[PDB]
Write a protein that binds this ligand. Sequence first.
Ligand code: ANP
Ligand code: MG
Length: 300
Amino acid sequence: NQALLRILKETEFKKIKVLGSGAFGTVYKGLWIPEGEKVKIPVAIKELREANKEILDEAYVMASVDNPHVCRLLGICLTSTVQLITQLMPFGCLLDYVREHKDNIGSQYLLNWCVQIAKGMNYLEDRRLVHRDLAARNVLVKTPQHVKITDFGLAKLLGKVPIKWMALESILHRIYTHQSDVWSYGVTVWELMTFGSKPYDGIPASEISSILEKGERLPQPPICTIDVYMIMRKCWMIDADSRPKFRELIIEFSKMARDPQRYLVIQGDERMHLPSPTDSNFYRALMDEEDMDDVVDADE
Ligand SMILES: Nc1ncnc2c1ncn2[C@@H]1O[C@H](COP(=O)(O)OP(=O)(O)NP(=O)(O)O)[C@@H](O)[C@H]1O
Ligand SMILES: [Mg+2]
């Protein structure tokens, strides 16, 4: 649908500050200045490094993604460069969030984030869409209780490879499927449960396919019980059809969230509950009016 993607003129918005850059482009905090208005509305703008018909075709798919746990493409400006406009997320990405909060995050948040990421990826799988670059850096925090997958469509649009997130078949043959996204999901879960450790830290990207072929995998995070680590390891089976399905991961992590201290061991966890209804309501009113499923609370 034409209606989902806004074509912006360069005069309608301005880049203000670089937020960073990765494999496909550079992101800026920007301002949208709607013509004839005096308001300045914060947005994120991603300008791609390095056709228009093909670009717009993929942009319309990206703009069609409508799920509480996946970011939608809102607008595009095609000039000499491709610029992608999306909602700005002040909390930033979940990788930085778990690093910065390494001592104040409880099991309920971690297990619910795993549910939310699996729900967003399952939505993509149901639409027959493959992400190709899932990682904790590509999950954005809308509120601490609500996360969203970002950068859907970018890898396809432009495809340093994120070797350390990639299924072995993607590394060796650039094969990407829902089940290779499941491998990346397992790495993403490992990043969360380690509070943002670097996977395979110190090992050169060029050594990784050899390590995987020998059967070596990312280590058990100290907070994870064996059932949680077995899920991660199942995501990294060489046989892609032996890996879990995202819909299975929604079920498993939701079950775990109903008994969180049975599945993760975190110092001080009893002091780290989900927000009260009062605090949740206040967050939603200021930052998060969109429809979403209830978070999974503990039975006890
Ligand atoms: N909508 C957004 N709101 C706020 N920060 C954002 C948004 N989108 C991206 N960022 C941040 O902008 C920076 C650049 O992102 P990006 O160019 O996608 O690199 P990356 O996520 O680190 N790696 P990759 O996506 O794998 O290429 C990172 O710090 C992102 O977290
Ligand atoms: Mg990114």
